Design a protein around this ligand. Structure first.
Ligand SMILES: CCCCCCCCCCO[C@@H]1O[C@H](CO)[C@@H](O[C@H]2O[C@H](CO)[C@@H](O)[C@H](O)[C@H]2O)[C@H](O)[C@H]1O
Ligand SMILES: CCCCCCCCCCO[C@@H]1O[C@H](CO)[C@@H](O[C@H]2O[C@H](CO)[C@@H](O)[C@H](O)[C@H]2O)[C@H](O)[C@H]1O
Ligand SMILES: CCCCCCCCCCO[C@@H]1O[C@H](CO)[C@@H](O[C@H]2O[C@H](CO)[C@@H](O)[C@H](O)[C@H]2O)[C@H](O)[C@H]1O
Ligand SMILES: [F-]
Ligand code: NA
Lengths: 124, 96
């Protein structure tokens, strides 16, 4: 039950942030909606920093780790919105931007996870 | 905030039995445009066809000479909140 509240609180904050950023900013650049991109890149960055940080202090409260990873990062990022965006571009005959969106979301988010991990690891 | 309806719908070339039309895309992901046409005198069937989302022109054929036609274009478009929906139409009248 304590773990459930961590997931719900973190998830609700992440989901809310994604909703606000997506509705506000996605229509600015419809070929690669920047709200959906930013939240995937940010979630990647956060999970990376979490990966490195939680390794250093393994006996810290599981509550904080669960709220941040399953909760926040999990609520914040989305494969579903990413998929329909790409699917719509594919149906629209816009192959160059469908390919670009897949590469920028996937390669970008993996790079952000690496950056988050290595920034904390370098910060000693 | 962003309109999903095309702008500046117009006839760019015409023969007695055909019309080449064009429009400016709305600033959204258009999956396809739907073009409708029928005689303005409201006693004839309206026809529709689609063009891909990358195209912003269309040919309308098999028309009758000297007759007023009502021509509309709307989009089937992707957006965040509404996923796939249809925009309102933009409409013109043109006499062959
Ligand atoms: C997504 C996350 C990315 C990481 C970004 C960095 C954010 C860190 C802010 C909080 O800093 C932590 O505060 C703890 C509480 O003050 C410290 O624990 C210290 O105090 C605890 C007791 O309060 C002990 O259990 C610990 O061993 C002892 O290190 C800990 O060192 C420190 O780092
Ligand atoms: C990323 C965002 C920032 C989040 C930071 C959160 C700050 C609060 C963390 C405090 O967590 C405590 O850490 C202790 C140690 O660090 C643990 O002690 C446990 O582990 C110790 C080390 O093995 C033992 O000495 C203790 O006896 C044992 O109770 C303790 O259970 C745990 O609650
Ligand atoms: C590796 C990732 C795999 C994930 C799976 C992706 C599935 C792809 C679905 C594509 O959907 C089709 O896309 C065509 C191309 O956009 C559309 O054709 C439209 O556009 C064509 C070219 O513009 C025209 O020839 C057609 O008549 C016209 O219907 C067609 O309607 C649409 O159903
Ligand atoms: F996308
Ligand atoms: Na998610």
């Amino acid at each position: 039950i304590k773990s459930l509240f961590a997931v719900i609180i973190g998830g609700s904050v992440g989901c809310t942030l994604r909703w606000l950023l997506s509705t506000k900013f996605n229509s600015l650049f419809p070929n690669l909606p920047p709200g959906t991109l930013v939240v995937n890149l940010l979630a990647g960055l956060i999970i990376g920093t979490a990966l490195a940080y939680f390794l250093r202090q393994p006996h810290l409260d599981p509550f904080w780790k669960l709220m941040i990873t399953t909760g926040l990062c999990g609520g914040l990022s989305t494969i579903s919105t990413f998929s329909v965006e790409v699917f719509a571009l594919l149906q629209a005959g816009n192959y160059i931007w469908a390919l670009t969106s897949v590469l920028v979301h996937v390669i970008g988010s993996l790079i952000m996870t690496a950056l988050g991990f290595f920034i904390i690891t370098i910060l000693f | 905030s962003v309109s999903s309806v095309p702008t500046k719908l117009e006839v760019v070339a015409a023969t007695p039995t055909s019309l080449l039309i064009s429009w400016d895309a709305p600033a959204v992901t258009v999956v396809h445009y739907v073009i409708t046409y029928g005689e303005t005198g409201g006693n004839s069937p309206v026809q529709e066809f689609t063009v891909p989302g990358s195209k912003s022109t269309a040919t309308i054929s098999g028309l009758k000479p000297g007759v007023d036609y009502t021509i509309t274009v709307y989009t089937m478009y992707y957006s965040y909140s509404d996923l796939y929906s249809y925009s309102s139409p933009i409409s013109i009248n043109y006499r062959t």
